[PDB]
Design a protein around this ligand. Structure first.
Ligand SMILES: OC[C@H]1O[C@H](O[C@H]2O[C@H](CO)[C@@H](O)[C@H](O)[C@H]2O)[C@H](O)[C@@H](O)[C@@H]1O
Ligand code: FES
Length: 108
């Protein structure tokens, strides 16, 4: 199941939005007009990447320790995080950005 998360126009390029499904929080990033979904919480600590992060192209920085992650793959790009982000498949259906919330994957 792909689930309605947000509208294409709700997240302009270079920006992030937090979405909720059941008990999980997911960050939606618009990289160059394409949408990517990762876990919202940084893996290194209790800090939100959509609300406390900064998006630099396809790379999100966590403001607490300046850890960095690729939003496309979840891959750690800069320390101190040890573990990559969960990433979730994305479908665009017209205006809708859809996330498959049950289908989290990990790079490693
Ligand atoms: O408030 C209940 C609804 O919450 C979500 O939808 C809101 O937030 C989205 C992303 O920020 C917006 O696209 C949407 O227009 C808002 O209504 C949730 O997706 C819905 O299923 C809930 O009914
Ligand atoms: S909490 Fe995100 S880098 Fe430490």
């Amino acid at each position: 199941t792909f689930t309605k998360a947000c509208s294409v126009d709700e997240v302009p390029p270079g920006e992030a939005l937090q979405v909720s499904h059941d008990a999980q929080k997911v960050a939606i990033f618009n990289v160059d007009g394409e949408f990517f979904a990762t876990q919202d919480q940084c893996t290194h600590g209790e800090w939100s990447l959509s609300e406390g992060g900064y998006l630099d192209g396809d790379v999100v920085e966590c403001s607490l320790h300046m850890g960095k992650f690729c939003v496309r793959t979840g891959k750690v790009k800069s320390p101190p995080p040890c573990e990559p982000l969960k990433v979730y498949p994305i479908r665009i259906e017209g205006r809708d950005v859809l996330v498959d919330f049950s289908r989290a994957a990990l790079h490693a």
